[PDB]
Design an enzyme around this catalytic site. Structure first.
Site, PDB file in Angstrom:
ATOM      1  N   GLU A 187       0.854  -1.229   0.000  1.00 17.24           N
ATOM      2  CA  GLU A 187       0.000   0.000   0.000  1.00 17.24           C
ATOM      3  C   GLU A 187       0.873   1.257   0.000  1.00 17.24           C
ATOM      4  O   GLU A 187       0.604   2.141  -0.830  1.00 17.24           O
ATOM      5  CB  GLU A 187      -0.939   0.018   1.201  1.00 17.24           C
ATOM      6  CG  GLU A 187      -2.108  -0.939   1.078  1.00 17.24           C
ATOM      7  CD  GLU A 187      -3.110  -0.580  -0.006  1.00 17.24           C
ATOM      8  OE1 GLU A 187      -2.937   0.483  -0.620  1.00 17.24           O
ATOM      9  OE2 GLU A 187      -4.052  -1.362  -0.227  1.00 17.24           O
ATOM     10  N   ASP A 217     -11.993   8.737  -8.584  1.00 22.12           N
ATOM     11  CA  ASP A 217     -13.259   9.275  -8.018  1.00 22.12           C
ATOM     12  C   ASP A 217     -13.036  10.646  -7.357  1.00 22.12           C
ATOM     13  O   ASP A 217     -14.058  11.273  -7.027  1.00 22.12           O
ATOM     14  CB  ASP A 217     -13.936   8.265  -7.078  1.00 22.12           C
ATOM     15  CG  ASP A 217     -13.279   8.052  -5.720  1.00 22.12           C
ATOM     16  OD1 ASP A 217     -12.437   8.876  -5.344  1.00 22.12           O
ATOM     17  OD2 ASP A 217     -13.638   7.056  -5.042  1.00 22.12           O
ATOM     18  N   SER A 276     -11.361  11.058  -4.453  1.00 23.30           N
ATOM     19  CA  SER A 276     -10.985  10.755  -3.051  1.00 23.30           C
ATOM     20  C   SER A 276      -9.476  10.486  -3.009  1.00 23.30           C
ATOM     21  O   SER A 276      -8.846  10.360  -4.075  1.00 23.30           O
ATOM     22  CB  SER A 276     -11.791   9.614  -2.503  1.00 23.30           C
ATOM     23  OG  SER A 276     -11.450   8.380  -3.120  1.00 23.30           O
ATOM     24  N   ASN A 312      -7.315   9.069  -6.066  1.00 26.76           N
ATOM     25  CA  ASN A 312      -8.072   8.070  -6.877  1.00 26.76           C
ATOM     26  C   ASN A 312      -8.861   8.802  -7.961  1.00 26.76           C
ATOM     27  O   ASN A 312      -9.085  10.010  -7.824  1.00 26.76           O
ATOM     28  CB  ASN A 312      -8.994   7.190  -6.028  1.00 26.76           C
ATOM     29  CG  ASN A 312      -8.296   6.647  -4.804  1.00 26.76           C
ATOM     30  OD1 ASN A 312      -7.472   5.749  -4.914  1.00 26.76           O
ATOM     31  ND2 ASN A 312      -8.596   7.206  -3.645  1.00 26.76           N
ATOM     32  N   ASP A 361     -15.870  -3.794   9.036  1.00 27.36           N
ATOM     33  CA  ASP A 361     -16.963  -3.143   8.262  1.00 27.36           C
ATOM     34  C   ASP A 361     -17.741  -4.187   7.442  1.00 27.36           C
ATOM     35  O   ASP A 361     -18.737  -3.798   6.792  1.00 27.36           O
ATOM     36  CB  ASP A 361     -16.414  -2.027   7.365  1.00 27.36           C
ATOM     37  CG  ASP A 361     -17.464  -1.037   6.872  1.00 27.36           C
ATOM     38  OD1 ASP A 361     -18.399  -0.733   7.659  1.00 27.36           O
ATOM     39  OD2 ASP A 361     -17.337  -0.566   5.704  1.00 27.36           O
TER      40      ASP A 361
HETATM   41  C1  NDG Z   1      -9.506   0.136   3.591  1.00 24.75           C
HETATM   42  C2  NDG Z   1      -9.139   1.226   2.639  1.00 24.75           C
HETATM   43  O1  NDG Z   1      -9.556   2.374   2.765  1.00 24.75           O
HETATM   44  N1  NDG Z   1      -8.334   0.871   1.643  1.00 24.75           N
HETATM   45  C3  NDG Z   1      -8.066   1.742   0.524  1.00 24.75           C
HETATM   46  C4  NDG Z   1      -9.256   1.717  -0.429  1.00 24.75           C
HETATM   47  O2  NDG Z   1     -10.377   2.268   0.249  1.00 24.75           O
HETATM   48  C5  NDG Z   1      -8.967   2.481  -1.713  1.00 24.75           C
HETATM   49  O3  NDG Z   1      -9.991   2.216  -2.667  1.00 24.75           O
HETATM   50  C6  NDG Z   1      -7.628   2.037  -2.286  1.00 24.75           C
HETATM   51  C7  NDG Z   1      -7.211   2.841  -3.486  1.00 24.75           C
HETATM   52  O4  NDG Z   1      -7.443   2.123  -4.691  1.00 24.75           O
HETATM   53  O5  NDG Z   1      -6.599   2.213  -1.296  1.00 24.75           O
HETATM   54  C8  NDG Z   1      -6.772   1.350  -0.188  1.00 24.75           C
HETATM   55  O6  NDG Z   1      -6.826   0.019  -0.602  1.00 24.75           O
END
Ligand code: NDG
Ligand code: CL
Ligand code: CL
Ligand code: CL
Ligand code: CL
Ligand code: CL
Ligand code: NA
Length: 129
Positions: free
Chosen positions: A35, A48, A50, A46, A101
């Protein structure tokens, strides 16, 4: 802050992620690696509109407030800026809320794609925990 592999496992263990909802330490360290590369300061925008924040790339659509994701939630009750801290308390407390969740660690696509069904114990092999 950029964590060492064993340094992050101890911190995660200290904050109670080891076997949190059946998920061994190896899963959380494996996820951190793919990550954030263990970088607390990691941000990714992203499509979207966000943004993902910190060691576990937690998303502004649902979990935190960055004040620029229109129609989003703040279910962890934190500025997203709190997830970039060298203290992982905030990321870990929010991760706990996310993994509970309903979908478990599938909430992290990198986990589904890169850690799920792998020898994740390799990630804590050698460390004093
Ligand atoms: C649990 C969490 O928030 N993980 C995030 C996910 O929400 C998001 O879509 C992604 C980007 O593609 O990054 C992480 O995987
Ligand atoms: Cl590593
Ligand atoms: Cl493990
Ligand atoms: Cl917002
Ligand atoms: Cl810490
Ligand atoms: Cl689960
Ligand atoms: Na938000």
């Amino acid at each position: 802050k950029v964590f060492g592999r064993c340094e992050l496992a101890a911190a995660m263990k200290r904050h109670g992620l080891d076997n949190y909802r059946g998920y061994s330490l190896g899963n959380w360290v494996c996820a951190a690696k793919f990550e954030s590369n263990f970088n607390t300061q990691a941000t990714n925008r992203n499509t979207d509109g966000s943004t993902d924040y910190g060691i576990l790339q937690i998303n502004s659509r649902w979990w935190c407030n960055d004040g620029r994701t229109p129609g989003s939630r703040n279910l962890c009750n934190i500025p997203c800026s709190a997830l970039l801290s060298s203290d992982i308390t905030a990321s870990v407390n929010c991760a706990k809320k996310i993994v509970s969740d309903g979908n478990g660690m599938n909430a992290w696509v990198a986990w589904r794609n890169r850690c799920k069904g792998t020898d994740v114990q390799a990630w804590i092999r050698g460390c004093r925990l």
